[PDB]
């Protein structure tokens, strides 16, 4: 794999327990930087209603390539190539106080999206038990720290 630099979140999917109020309306580019020892850090912002939310996530190496962990292993994070296109899928499993949470994100180097890529995302998403009608596409923006 290769993982550091800028990524763009083009589509998003969430399990059916995920509250609608909780969905990102907007989202910045994701800057991924290495910290030595294989460990990474992703930085980004997104809008949840009128609220700008800032994230900075330590992603620790694991014995499987493409698989990472965050928040002490509370959350597991897989990066997989999305076949037939030049994008990847960012799949997360989060052992949250409130239950196990699944979440998928279509990510790519190029900020543009092809409909065929969204379709492969949907297909792959459905394979994993998640649903098409819970696929949403937040607005791509700069940081919301400006406003």
Swiss-Prot record:
Keyword Transport found: yes
Organs and tissues of expression: Strongly expressed in the nasal structures, salivary and lachrymal glands, and lung. Expressed in the liver.
CDD domains per record: lipocalin_1_3_4_13-like
Organism domain of life: Eukaryota
Entry keyword annotation includes Metal-binding: no
A GO molecular function held by the record: odorant binding
Pfam family, one: Lipocalin
Biological processes per GO annotation: glucose homeostasis; sensory perception of chemical stimulus; sensory perception of smell
Disulfide-linked positions: 52-144
PANTHER family linked to this entry: LIPOCALIN, ODORANT-BINDING PROTEIN 2A-RELATED
Subunit and interaction comment: Monomer.
Name this polypeptide is given: Odorant-binding protein 2a
Chain's gene name: OBP2A
């Amino acid at each position: 794999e290769d993982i550091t630099g800028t990524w763009y979140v083009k589509a998003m999917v969430v399990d059916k327990d995920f509250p609608e109020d909780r969905r990102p309306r907007k989202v910045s580019p994701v800057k991924v930087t290495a910290l030595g020892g294989g460990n990474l850090e992703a930085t980004f912002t997104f809008m949840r209603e009128d609220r700008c939310i800032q994230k900075k996530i330590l992603m620790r190496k694991t014995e499987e390539p493409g698989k990472f962990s965050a928040y002490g292993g509370r959350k597991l994070i897989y990066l997989q190539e999305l076949p037939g296109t030049d994008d990847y899928v960012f799949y997360s499993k989060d052992q949250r106080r409130g239950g196990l949470r699944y979440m998928g994100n279509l990510v790519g180097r190029n900020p543009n999206t092809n409909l065929e890529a969204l379709e492969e995302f949907k297909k792959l998403v459905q394979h994993k038990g998640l649903s098409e009608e819970d696929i949403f596409m937040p607005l791509q923006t700069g940081s919301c720290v400006l406003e």
